[PDB]
Amino acid sequence: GSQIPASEQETLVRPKPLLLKLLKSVGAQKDTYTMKEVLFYLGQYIMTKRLYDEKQQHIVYCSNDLLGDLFGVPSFSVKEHRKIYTMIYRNLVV
Numbered sequence: 869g870s871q872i873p874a875s876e877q878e879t880l881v882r883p884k885p886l887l888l889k890l891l892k893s894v895g896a897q898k899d900t901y902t903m904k905e906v907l908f909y910l911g912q913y914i915m916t917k918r919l920y921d922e923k924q925q926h927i928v929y930c931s932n933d934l935l936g937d938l939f940g941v942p943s944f945s946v947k948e949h950r951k952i953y954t955m956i957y958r959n960l961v962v
């Protein structure tokens with residue numbers, strides 16, 4: 869479940885306030901982005917907060933970070949792209 873159509877990646881989206889705060893924390897100071905750009909910046913967020921040092925396995929543990937509050941989960945797999953898109957879609961305006 870790691871494949872996402874280009875059309876979804878390239879669609880413009882408006883993050884809700886908590887997602888916007890996470891994006892601004894890594895220097896993304898816009899209110900409209902493509903989904904791919906959101907995923908780029910959230911990847912940089914994960915790395916900057918040291919939530920993925922064990923790169924030879926797939927899990928991000930986020931129960932002690934605002935990312936866990938945003939996604940509503942204690943952990944997730946980086947390979948499960950569809951599940952991640954669903955969790956981000958719950959944090960977009962309409």
Ligand SMILES: Cc1c(C(=O)O)ccc2c3n(nc12)[C@@H]1[C@H](C3)N(CC2CC2)[C@@]2(C(=O)Nc3cc(Cl)ccc32)[C@H]1c1cccc(Cl)c1F
Pocket residue numbers: 870907908910911912914915920926946947948949950952953
């Ligand atoms: C597909 C695949 C496999 C595999 O094939 O076994 C194995 C590892 C993978 C990894 N990603 N894809 C992987 C990448 C990357 C590690 N990760 C960052 C992490 C390093 C810090 C990403 C990333 O770049 N941005 C990001 C943002 C969030 Cl919120 C959550 C996970 C990631 C992932 C990813 C990229 C494109 C769209 C999606 Cl939806 C997505 F989740």
